[PDB]
Design a protein around this ligand. Structure first.
Ligand SMILES: C[C@@H](c1oc(=O)c2ccccc2c1C1=CCN(C)CC1)n1nc(-c2cc(O)cc(F)c2)c2c(N)ncnc21
Ligand SMILES: [Cl-]
Lengths: 932, 160
């Protein structure tokens, strides 16, 4: 139905109930309300319409004062159609932001209050102050700094030939433009000057200008040459004339506007009182295994309770003493429970739960604690406990199972884990063996003790072996913990590569993570971006809410808008996961508060995303009943509705916020009538140029994280190759998870799949029909370079699942791989061989039988490509290690990482590795003929 | 005992493990789906509470605001003004009852779905021991045939 009856609560106590249109804006509803109110009592005591604001209860259960009255009631989306008039006055800016945050981050901000938690409340106090302040300091800086913040430089890696080519520059609010020639090695200041000279023909300074690539939020500035910019690099390669606009600084300003722990030598213990809401088999009996942990390793032996009979509310009431003293517990000591169901005496993991012993203020937890457990999932490892599992409580306190335990009072005063000054106190005072150390470090219980004895030598001569020396340390003895922490203070700064290793769950200590972040501060924004996905997943390993890694990510998010955008979506797309909903919720709130400009961008994207979900659901409801042409017509009729059209129109692309999705081309929109039924949405932009058309695929039903991870890794290789002067013409198109099994994929235009193009020498003739005459030599070189790149990439990453309909080719000649579903050999797995395909090998050789000259160049590209990845092999191992946090089925253990060790052959030397690669190559060249 | 009879058992036990793995993974989808629906129901109830609460502030206002204003025309001039106000008030109170009835219905479904959540988990925890014991059995037979020296090709054809 079109209309809807809305309840209206007037400030006099009077009540009105009349129908309004779902499409009416709130400004129109006030007018109608006032018109109706005049015929109800107490009207003469109301002030004017403009004196009041509507209030509603939004979908997240909070009062929201509806300041923007150009919004439709269907866009406001109140819980029940109920609006209350209230006084405008107050702190309207704080109230507006808090509501917008709740709606954007998914969770209502009241739910953080509802918890009654010091750690949450302290986190929200400290970070929101930090982010608000950083945003305030950002405003007081100049337009240049703001331009660097908002539109950071997009450069080509290495951040040679000096040919000349034309370039179009103009000024804002002017149809006419001045075309002129410049060189590739010119700085951007020199380009502006010629435009300002061309301006001064009949008739300012260059330093009060920047160049905007028109149709985009992408600006050319700084002390880099014109060639190093991605636009001019993409223009000079393609041949298109680079269009630019001269923006004034004022126009950029327009956009901008005493008890000791070690004295207590008593053994550790807990009272195990009760279970709760336990759903097990009544014939069986319940047992609770408990174990202390510091990372993956145990601090002492794992104790157990007695066998009580299975019921909803089992009652144990037992002391469970452990083989460790209260003084010996390290800062990150982690008590870990698992409730098991066992058969009648003379195993079913029911649930599990973990608890940090010390709290966030460093105090040892005392008294009763109710751990709402997480349900155990059967896995291949078959472990007893889940020490790597999350430390937060299960949010489903309504129906989830619980274990009631009580950590007893260790002393009358509250005892804390000692401060750094007293840690360094204990740590301060305390040719032959060097040969064995070299051999062990530069390559077990014997070896670990040698690493411990010569730890000063490890610090002195083997600084990069810090991770090894950490894992050999005995964290269940406080003397040993002090000594290792003492060395850590004076430990020399490690490179980014070594720091990444230290962010893994194996190193839970706060000082280690702090050291790790201390070494990641040298990251430039470009390189941070390559690891952002990995860093966000590591947040799931953190014990406490406030951590050095969280501060780091927010700092970089607030200093670079592009980084914050992707930080936001990475976090936002996991808010459906109870494990991280709270943690991620709190980081997103802090971000928003220091990023009110980008909130308006993110708000627009969210409502674009919300309409597409609805639009895809309608297409799913329609495609089962009706055929495609009618459903395609019915998709457009929905899209052309004001609510839809305005929401989908005029937004920054989530996949790239510099791309401007302006006018949706409804005629060119469509969907694929198989599988999850992904929407194909096309946009236009007359200000842009030849690449004025852009596309997005909205898919809802698959989890896009593994497709993003794989795409991200191919992008990394492409950067790593480019840095050594090798461009293999890859297409690492964008892929962004935005929600629960929901995301956007960047459309690569002017491309079909090999399967569709093949419907004798079909690919060679297709490339002829897209590159006739002298263009064909480009297309084959684009094919050969790219084919080599994706041959190596898919080999190294262990990518199965390849076939004619998930490899695509571009009209330029470039071959590229899409829709990555499986990797690292993978559910059982086998080694994927290196795979040459006859049809590709046919195109590479220009359609001949034997073309040894060309084929050797292709052989060389593969060898060189593969050799370069080997030089950065540890980067891939470390990055993949941290992705185990993501809980991907195919990336969840040490053997999944071992696949990359073997495929890159890190255990072999550089000569020996390339000899094996040749054998795999040739065998692939032979196997391409055989089998039919 | 013999390699054919053990390999034949490896095939039967793997099929049974694959079927049981599907049944658990199907039930686990329902545990998550139900888990999300209950949390949505829980927020909707808080939304009802917050709405009801706003209506009860309206009554407070209605009484406080009537009291003072009503005395000026309480038997002084027009008692028609009084009847419009109190009829309008009964219209407010009457709306609250519906919203309460709608809150009441969502409480009833949340109770019924809390029971459902609980029966999924109970059925999940009954399957786990058989799923695990079929995982170990499958693996022991694989280990036995590998020791006996059975080639990887022959193991593949048994595994599915
Ligand atoms: C297979 C093709 C495609 O995918 C659809 O889903 C679709 C939907 C409605 C209409 C056409 C389509 C098509 C086309 C079919 C035939 N056309 C001549 C070309 C386009 N495709 N698929 C991905 C793609 C890549 C991913 O990593 C993940 C993902 F989920 C999709 C993709 C891309 N990134 N860029 C370009 N084309 C792309
Ligand atoms: Cl409802």
């Amino acid at each position: 139905n079109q209309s809807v009856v809305v309840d209206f609560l007037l400030p006099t106590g009077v009540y009105l109930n009349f129908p309004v249109s779902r499409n009416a804006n709130l400004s129109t509803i006030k007018q109608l309300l006032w018109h109706r109110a005049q015929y109800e009592p107490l009207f003469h005591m109301l002030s004017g319409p403009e004196a009041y604001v509507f209030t509603c209860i939004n979908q997240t259960a909070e009062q929201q004062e509806l300041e923007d009255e150009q919004r439709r009631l269907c866009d406001v989306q109140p819980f029940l159609p109920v609006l209350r008039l209230v006084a405008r006055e107050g702190d309207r800016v704080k109230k507006l932001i808090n509501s917008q945050i709740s709606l954007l981050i998914g969770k209502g901000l009241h739910e953080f209050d509802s918890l009654c938690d010091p750690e949450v409340n302290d986190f929200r106090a400290k970070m929101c102050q930090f982010c608000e302040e950083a945003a305030a300091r950002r405003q007081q800086l100049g337009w240049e700094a703001w331009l660097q913040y908002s539109f950071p430089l997009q450069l080509e890696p290495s951040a040679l030939p000096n040919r000349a080519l034309l370039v179009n520059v103009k000024f804002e609010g002017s149809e006419e433009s001045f075309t002129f020639q410049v060189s590739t090695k010119d700085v951007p200041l020199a380009l502006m000057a010629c435009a300002l000279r061309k301006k001064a023909t009949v008739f300012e300074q260059p330093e009060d200008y920047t160049l905007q690539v028109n149709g985009r939020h992408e600006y050319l500035y700084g002390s880099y040459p014109l060639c190093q910019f991605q636009y001019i690099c993409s223009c000079l390669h393609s041949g298109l004339t680079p269009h630019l606009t001269m923006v004034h600084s004022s126009s950029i300003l327009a956009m901008r506007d005493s008890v000791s722990l070690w004295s207590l030598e008593q053994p550790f213990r807990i009272e195990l009182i009760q279970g709760s809401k336990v759903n097990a088999d009544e014939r069986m009996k319940l047992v609770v295994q408990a174990g202390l942990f510091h990372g993956n390793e145990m601090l002492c032996k794992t104790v157990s309770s007695s066998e009580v009979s299975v019921c909803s509310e089992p009652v144990w009431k037992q002391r469970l003493e452990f083989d460790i003293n209260i003084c010996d517990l390290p800062r990150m000591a982690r008590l870990c429970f698992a409730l098991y169901a066992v058969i009648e005496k003379a195993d079913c993991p029911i649930a599990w739960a973990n608890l940090m012993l010390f709290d966030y203020k460093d105090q040892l937890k005392t008294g009763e604690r109710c751990l709402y457990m997480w349900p155990s999932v059967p896995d291949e490892k078959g472990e007893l406990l889940n020490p790597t599992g999350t430390v937060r409580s299960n949010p489903n306190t309504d129906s989830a199972a619980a274990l009631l335990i009580c950590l007893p009072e260790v002393a009358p005063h509250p005892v804390y884990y000692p401060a750094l000054e007293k840690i360094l106190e204990l740590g301060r005072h305390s040719e032959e063996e060097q040969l064995q150390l070299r051999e062990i470090l530069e390559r077990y219980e014997h070896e670990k003790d040698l690493v411990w004895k010569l730890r000063h030598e490890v610090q002195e001569h083997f600084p990069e072996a810090l991770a090894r020396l950490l894992l050999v340390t005995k964290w269940n003895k406080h003397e040993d913990v002090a000594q290792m922490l003492y060395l850590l203070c004076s430990w020399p700064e490690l490179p980014v590569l070594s720091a990444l290793e230290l962010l893994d769950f194996s190193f839970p200590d706060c000082h280690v993570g702090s050291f790790a972040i201390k070494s990641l501060r040298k990251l430039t924004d470009d390189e941070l971006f390559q690891y952002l996905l990995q860093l966000v997943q590591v947040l799931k390993y953190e014990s406490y809410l406030d951590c050095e890694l969280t501060k780091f990510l927010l700092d970089r998010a607030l200093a670079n808008r592009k980084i914050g955008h992707f930080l936001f979506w990475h976090l936002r797309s996991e808010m459906h996961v109870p494990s991280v909903a709270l943690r991620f919720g709190l980081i997103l709130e802090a971000y928003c508060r220091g990023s009110t400009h980008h909130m308006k961008v993110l708000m627009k994207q969210g409502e674009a995303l919300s309409k597409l979900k609805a639009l895809n659901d309608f297409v799913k409801l329609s495609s089962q009943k009706t055929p495609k042409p009618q459903t395609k017509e019915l998709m457009h009729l929905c899209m052309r509705q004001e609510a839809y059209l305005e929401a989908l129109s005029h937004l920054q692309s989530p996949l790239d916020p510099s791309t401007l999705l302006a006018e949706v081309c409804v005629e060119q929109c469509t969907f694929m009538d198989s599988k999850m039924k992904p929407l194909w949405i096309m946009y236009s932009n007359e200000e842009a140029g030849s690449g004025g058309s852009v596309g997005i695929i909205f898919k809802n039903g698959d989890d896009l994280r593994q497709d993003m991870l794989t795409l991200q890794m191919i992008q990394l290789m492409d950067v790593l190759w480019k840095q050594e002067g090798l461009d293999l013409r890859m297409t690492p198109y964008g892929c962004l998870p935005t929600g629960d099994r929901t995301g956007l994929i960047e459309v690569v235009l002017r491309s079909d799949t090999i399967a569709n193009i093949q419907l004798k020498d079909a690919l060679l003739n297709w490339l002829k029909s897209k590159n006739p005459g002298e263009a064909l030599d480009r297309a084959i070189e684009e094919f050969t370079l790219s084919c080599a790149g994706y041959c190596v990439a898919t080999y190294v990453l262990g990518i199965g699942d390849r076939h004619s309909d998930n490899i695509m080719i571009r009209e330029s000649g470039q071959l590229f791989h899409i829709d990555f579903g499986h990797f690292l050999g993978n559910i059982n797995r086998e080694r994927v061989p290196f795979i040459l395909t006859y049809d590709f090998v046919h195109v590479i050789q220009q359609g001949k039988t034997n073309n040894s000259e060309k084929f050797e160049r292709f052989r060389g590209y593969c060898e060189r490509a593969y050799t370069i990845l080997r030089r950065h092999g540890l980067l891939f191992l470390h990055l993949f290690a941290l992705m185990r946090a993501a809980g991907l089925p195919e990336l969840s253990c040490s053997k999944d990482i071992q696949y990359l060790k073997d495929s890159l052959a890190l255990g072999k030397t550089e000569e020996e590795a390339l000899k094996h690669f040749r054998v795999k190559f040739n065998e692939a060249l032979r196997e391409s003929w055989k089998t039919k | 005992d013999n390699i054919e009879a053990v390999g034949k058992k490896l095939h039967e036990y793997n099929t049974q493990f694959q079927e049981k793995s599907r049944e658990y993974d199907r039930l686990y989808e329902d545990y998550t789906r139900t888990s999300q629906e209950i949390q949505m129901k829980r927020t909707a109830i808080e939304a009802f509470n917050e709405t009801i609460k706003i209506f009860e502030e309206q009554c407070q206002t209605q009484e406080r605001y009537s009291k003072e204003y009503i005395e000026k025309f309480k038997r002084e001039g027009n008692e028609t003004e009084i009847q419009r106000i109190m009829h309008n008030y009964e219209k407010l109170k009457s709306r609250i009852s519906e919203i309460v009835d709608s809150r009441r219905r969502l409480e009833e479904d949340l109770k019924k779905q809390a029971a459902e959540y609980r029966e999924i988990d109970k059925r999940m925890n009954s399957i786990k021991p058989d799923l695990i014991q079929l995982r170990k059995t499958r693996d022991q037979y694989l280990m036995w045939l590998t020791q006996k020296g059975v080639r990887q090709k022959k193991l593949n054809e048994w595994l599915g």
